DNA sequence: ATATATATATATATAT
DNA sequence: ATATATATATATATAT
């Protein structure tokens, strides 16, 4: 396992505004809202990486619609670019004005790995995404996720997000914990990971070979179901406890008479499945739901990314089988509601700053990404290709 | 002889943030509504399990839409999550507003079983689910429901509700009274129910054998269904009542019998994989089996078009679901608007056969260890009964 | 049918409906009302004047009428069975007009 | 493109934008703007550096470019050859990816 | 300001 | 498998 040292360090940026730069801002906000029909008091300020909150508490009889209908004029009042309005803080009575900083601050990925939350996260599939609105890192478990969608326009950063999630996978698990299968119809960027001791097939060329490896994923799911129905327990990690935590004393624990190894995690990462669903038809569309309907205890998790998120490629046949979604900067509230049912993803800044709904419900989370360089990736790839070997399960195609 | 104290007792009830100072919450609500353009009077609080309904009496002249257009800012004012308004109470003149206290008291299943009418229940196959909006015991009866359909939500307890219903079956029968049979392509969440003496079938793992199981299902159906017309009643409740009054008349008629439930779930894989013969059989073990004792609960993950066609949707009277896509799924099974207002992970929308409005139920969790204790307690008194026509 | 809002009896003639559509969302009574009209047919009739044919989707309740001397066929269950009865009615109407 | 309102040409790159929609009602400047974009391309790029593919659904404007050394195809007046050009473009895109 | 009728735009049911 | 229509949702100028 290679260390954290190959990334760029946590630099120093003094662009974090002065307390006067927020205080005069806050008094100017109170003056400008007092010039309209509303009346409000700034209760707290939270600075941020790019956008910046304002905990404001309206006095009495001041409905939030009288802020959300002043929004654009308030934005031109403070001479900033635009303002989204927080409808509710969870647990706290105040509404929030989100104002983006002009000099936005890029968040390096080693800053995301710098938390004690990452390295002392008990799971084997962390998904380090980046610092939130307030600046705290939010890293969530893929095993409890259980699946992800990624959508955004061209250039909006989906390659960077997928590289961030994959390097989140790489730094924590051994080869015998979490294998992965990569599929890329846009045959250009995800070939960079070829050579690691984690990656089952070679990183594929066409869907013509990759659909058969996805049927192999189906058969691996059936192997997993047969062996967990036989040996008794339900979760994958429950069974992987059950094997070694029975064979403290040395035994292979023969099973339905071959041996028993550990039970690794499988992660299907797909670059652009819109191409695959278009150029095949509905067979692969059936395969995706057939995976994602029987997966959470199977230890096969699905990462998808597209470019058009419309219902031509993501039907209701998938839409209830992948709860957790991420959308990057998109072009329409149509597509916004389509892959983020709350809607609001058309107001993104670009270059990361995605929406995210947790494994709760109905409440999107705006968390910035991590600008991961390709050379950081190349260092990590060299560090794995020295610390390992070309391990493969062939005849997967 | 089934035991009832086999599982864990009522440990705590969490006190719901106060037993007394929610009067302060009520006064704060009064002040917050007077801050807007209504004047209101608050009567006594119903401190429910998770949510909490308030007796709220508006003054004269005001309409209820001035509460409905004001609910969200009432909610952000009152330091709570998400409230809504019930615009009618049958009886008195008040207006209901329900508020979700966040400390969700996890519903102790043996406390649901400790209900007096659960012990005093007439039929032999009841369905206990838990507490209501006010928190009442909600023991229903699938001898009267008598078909049930479950939708799919990955994190709500679709498995937990099935095991709750099955333990509800188990603690109120004798082996010569209840029979069950399962079909599940996910052979994972349910196969702990092998070794049950209440069975009348081996636990069906495959699907061609499930197509052999539904054949014996309709065969037994039409067998007893024309035998019932031979014995001259109309419904199978009448059939079992009269064969009870015949066997406990002491006469050995034997002219050529217990209940039978079909706890098939994940039925989408049958209706997608093996073919159309599944739904062609399910349509006629669906509608006609109503007064036939075969009650046929069902559960899938994504009910829209192929998974449920209308000739299986319509026959089942009474339905149950969890939080699903904000699309046609929101009312395909649920019959109302329940897209994401159902919280999931504890609550559910019940429909009785009459009064087609969704009664919302606080469900009760069941540990898999509780399931294993019940499986082992029936495994002690565990003489099986398999049949091999399948 | 019953009484109106004044409580005066409201009885209609089926020969001048000429047909009838019944609604109800498992609400007030949808089985009742059909049963009511059918028993009201039966109390002023003879089988040489009015014989009925029912089609039963859910064989629940009106599989109770079997045995009466005005019922031209037994209970009908399948819709594919019921299409034969509907085409029988069309053919009977056609020879009726002939 | 030409000037903005504050007296400066705003010359935007096509290699980053990276595609383009142009629309408007008749006579508002459509074919003139297309000509401006084309002559903007032509005064820097040799046929080594760039080369055009042109499709005319109307044989009125983009017919003058017939015979410049910056064409991969003749000016597509026809309709089926336009589909052929799009097939070729997808094929050239995929082989350049490989 | 705010509920109403209208025009536009999307997702699904279905004929070939 | 593909093209077509209706139902449903959604944004918009208006009389209240
Ligand atoms: N967090 C970020 N901060 C700044 N720029 C970013 C960030 N994430 C992505 N980008 C920019 O987005 C571009 C990548 O977009 P890309 O994923 O290639 O879109 P597509 O794959 O659809 O073409 C990169 O050039 C990168 O500079
Ligand atoms: N009353 C409850 N309290 C706590 N958790 C619950 C309760 N009811 C259900 N759950 C949760 O529901 C989950 C079960 O989901 P499940 O029915 O297995 O979905 P699926 O079958 O689609 O995987 C469990 O993880 C459990 O934590
Ligand atoms: N006037 C009445 N007073 C009291 N109960 C009635 C009255 N009319 C009908 N009902 C009851 O209401 C029930 C409504 O049933 P119904 O909606 O017809 O069931 P279904 O929709 O399955 O036919 C009837 O079964 C009947 O017993
Ligand atoms: N910058 C300009 N100055 C003056 N006239 C112009 C200018 N741009 C366009 N026009 C007029 O508009 C016409 C181009 O419109 P065109 O592209 O033909 O629209 P369409 O093709 O829809 O008819 C030209 O013939 C010219 O007369």
DSSP-assigned letters across all residues of B191-217: GGGTT-TTBSS--B-SSHHHHHHHHHH
> Looking up tokens 């209908």, which residue turns up?
A69
The label of the residue with tokens 């049927």 reads A215
Domain with CATH 3.30.980.40 in chain B: 1-105
Residue lying closest to nucleotide F1, CA to C1': A281
Tell me which ligand sits closest to the C-alpha of residue D3.
4
Question: Which experimental technique did the depositors report for determining this structure?
Answer: cryo-EM
Q: Say which residues have a Cβ less than 8 Å from residue B81's Cβ, sequence separation at least 6.
A: A90, B75, B100, B102
Positions of strand F less than 7 angstroms from a protein CB: 1-2, 10-11
The separation between CA C52 and the C-alpha centre of its own chain, rounded to angstroms, equals: 6
How far away, in angstroms, is A158 Cα from ligand 1 center?
A: 6
DSSP H helical ranges for chain A: 19-35, 65-68, 71-77, 109-113, 116-119, 158-170, 207-231, 236-244, 273-280, 283-292, 316-319, 333-339, 374-386
Q: Is B222 helix (H, G, I), strand (E, B) or coil?
A: helix
Q: What Cα–Cα distance (Å) separates residue A363 from each residue in A63, A341, B101?
A: 21, 10, 18
Find, among B246, B181, B191, B247, the residue nearest to B218 by Cα. B181
CB contact under 8 A, C60 and B291: yes
The answer to whether A108 touches A371, Cβ cutoff 8 Å, is yes
Residue D93 at interface with chain A, using a CB cutoff of 8 Å: no
Resolution in A: 4.3
CA atom of A296 to C1′ atom of E1, Å: 50
In terms of Cα–Cα distance, which of B107, B98, B101, B129 is closest to B13? Answer: B107
Rounded CA separation A270/A12 (Å): 36
Q: Cis bond leading into D35, ω under 30°? A: no
Q: Give yes or no for a contact between A95 and A58, defined as CB atoms under 8 angstroms apart.
A: yes
- DSSP H or E segment with residue A126: strand A126-131
Separation of CA B359 and C1' E16 in angstroms? 45
Where do the H-state alpha helices sit in A232-367? 236-244, 273-280, 283-292, 316-319, 333-339
Nearest to D39 by CA among D7, D16, D62, D15: D62
Kindly report the backbone phi and psi dihedral angles of residue A391, in degrees, each rounded to the nearest multiple of 5, phi listed first. Answer: -85, 135
From chain B, the residues in CB contact with A225 under 8 A are: 186-188
CA distances from A212 to A290, A326, A396, C96 (A): 14, 27, 7, 65
- Give the architecture-level CATH label for domain B106-390: 3-Layer(aba) Sandwich (3.40)
How far is it, in rounded angstroms, from Cα A100 to Cα A178? 38
Question: Is residue B301 classed exposed, middle or buried when 0-12, 13-18 and 19+ CB atoms within 10 A define those classes?
Answer: buried
Assess whether chains B and A touch, using the rule of 3 or more C-beta pairs within 8 angstroms: yes
Distance in Å from E5's C1' to B65's CA comes to 21
C-alpha torsion B233→B239→B241→B243, nearest 10:
110
Q: Give start-end residues of each CATH 3.40.50.300 domain in chain B.
A: 106-390
* Contacting A residues, span 335-354, partner chain B, CB-CB under 8 Å: 341
Residue found under tokens 């707290």: A44
Across the interface, of A229, A289, A296, the residue whose CB is closest to B187 is A229
- Is the CA virtual torsion C59, C64, C65, C67 positive or negative? positive
Task: Report yes or no: C36 and C1 within 8 Å, Cβ to Cβ.
Answer: yes
Rg of chain A, C-alpha, whole Å: 23
Distance CA B321, CA B350 (A): 8
Residue by residue, DSSP assigns A6-67 as: GS------TTSPPHHHHHHHHHHHHHHHHHTT--EEEEEEE--SSEEEEEEEE-SS--THHH
Nucleotide with minimal C1' distance from the CA of B310 is E13
Any idea which ligand is nearest the CA of D33?
4
Q: DSSP 3-state assignment of C97? A: helix
CB B259 within 8 Å of CB B240: yes
Whose tokens are 């974009």? That residue is D37
Q: What share of chain D is helix, strand, coil (3-state, %, to 5)?
A: 30, 5, 60
For D74, what's the count of Cα atoms within 13 Å in the CB-facing half-sphere?
5
Q: Which has the closest alpha carbon to A67: A86, A54, A93? A: A86
| Contact residues of ligand 1, CB 6 A cut-off | A 106, 154-160, 307, 351-352, 369, 371
The total number of residues written for chain C in this structure: 98
Separation of alpha carbons B265 and B299, rounded Å: 4
How much distance in Å is there from the Cα of B346 to the middle of ligand 2?
8
- Give chain D's length: 98
Total residues found in chain B within this entry:
390
Q: How far apart are CA B35 and CA A302, in angstroms?
A: 50
Residue to mutate, D1, D30, D32, ligand 4, most ligand atoms under 8 Å from C-beta: D32
Q: Which of C26, C58, C59 sits opposite B356 (nearest CB)?
A: C26
Sign of CA dihedral A3, A4, A5, A7: positive
- Give the tokens for residue B24: 């302060």
Return the CATH architecture of domain A1-105: 2-Layer Sandwich (3.30)
Tell me how many degrees the CA angle A169-A126-A98 measures, rounded to the nearest 5.
120
| Closest atom, ligand 4, to C-alpha of D25 | 22
Kindly state whether A228 is in contact with chain B, defined as any CB-CB distance less than 8 angstroms. Answer: yes
Alpha-carbon distance A133 to A50, whole Å?
A: 8
Q: Quote the tokens at residue A331.
A: 């072009």
Inter-residue contact B48 to B15 (CB < 8 Å): no
Dihedral angle over CA of B61, B66, B67, B72, nearest 10 = -160
Which residue of A lies nearest to B326 if distances are taken between CA atoms? A341
Closest CA to A226 of A294, A179, A292: A294
Q: Are strands A325-327 and B95-100 parallel, antiparallel or unpaired?
A: unpaired
Cα first-last separation, chain B: 30
Q: D9-22: b or e for each residue (b if 16 or more CB lie within 10 Å)?
A: eeeeeeeeeeeeee
As a rounded value in angstroms, the CA-to-C1' distance for B195 and F3 is 54
Class of domain A106-397 as given by CATH: alpha beta
Question: What are the φ and ψ backbone dihedral angles of B113, each rounded to 5 degrees?
Answer: -70, -20
Q: What is the distance, to the nearest Å, from the Cα of residue B349 to the centroid of all Cα atoms in its chain? A: 8
Nearest-Å Rg of the Cα atoms of chain D is: 15
**Where do the CATH 3.40.50.300 domains begin and end in chain A?**
106-397
Q: Which H/E stretch holds residue D38?
A: helix D30-42
Strands A147-151, A325-327: pairing kind: parallel
Q: How many beta carbons lie within 10 A of that of residue B258, not counting itself? A: 15
Report which DSSP code applies to A127: E
- Collapsing DSSP states into helix, strand and coil, what is residue A119? helix
């Amino acid at each position: 396992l290679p260390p954290l040292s190959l990334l760029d360090p946590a630099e120093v940026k003094q662009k974090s505004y002065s307390p006067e730069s927020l205080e005069a801002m806050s008094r100017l906000l109170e003056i400008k809202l007092k010039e309209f029909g509303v009346e409000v008091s700034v209760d707290s300020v939270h600075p941020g990486p790019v956008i910046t909150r304002f905990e404001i508490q309206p006095a009495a009889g001041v409905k939030v619609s009288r802020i959300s209908n002043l929004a654009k004029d308030l934005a031109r009042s403070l001479a900033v670019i635009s303002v989204r309005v927080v409808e509710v803080i969870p647990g706290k009575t105040t509404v929030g004005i989100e104002i983006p900083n002009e000099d936005r601050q890029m968040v390096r990925f080693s800053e995301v790995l710098s938390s004690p939350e990452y390295d002392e996260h008990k799971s084997t599939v962390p998904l380090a995404l980046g610092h939130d609105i307030g600046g705290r890192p939010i890293i969530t478990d893929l095993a409890k996720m259980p699946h992800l969608l990624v959508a955004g326009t061209t250039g909006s950063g989906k390659s960077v997000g997928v590289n961030a999630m994959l390097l989140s996978i790489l730094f924590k698990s051994t080869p015998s914990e979490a294998r992965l299968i990569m599929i890329d119809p846009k045959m250009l960027e995800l070939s960079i990971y070829e050579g690691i001791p984690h990656l089952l097939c070679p990183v594929v060329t066409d869907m013509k070979e990759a659909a058969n490896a996805l049927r192999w994923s189906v058969a691996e799911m059936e192997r997993r179901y047969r062996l967990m129905a036989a040996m008794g327990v339900r979760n994958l990690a429950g069974f992987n406890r059950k094997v070694k935590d029975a064979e403290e004393a040395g035994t292979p624990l023969t099973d339905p008479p071959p041996q028993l190894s550990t039970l690794p995690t499988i992660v299907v990462v797909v670059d652009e499945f819109a191409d695959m669903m278009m150029i095949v038809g509905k067979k692969v569309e059936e395969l995706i739901a057939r995976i994602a309907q029987k997966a959470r205890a199977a230890g096969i998790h699905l990462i998808l990314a597209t470019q058009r998120p419309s219902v031509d490629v993501i039907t209701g046949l998938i839409k209830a089988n992948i709860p957790t979604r991420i959308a990057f900067q998109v072009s329409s509230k149509i597509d916004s509601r389509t892959i983020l049912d709350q809607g609001g993803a058309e107001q993104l800044l670009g270059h990361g700053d995605m929406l995210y709904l947790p494994p709760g419900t109905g409440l999107p989370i705006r968390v910035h990404g991590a600008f991961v360089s390709d050379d950081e990736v190349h260092r990590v790839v060299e560090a794995w290709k020295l610390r390992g070997a070309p391990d493969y399960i062939e005849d997967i195609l």
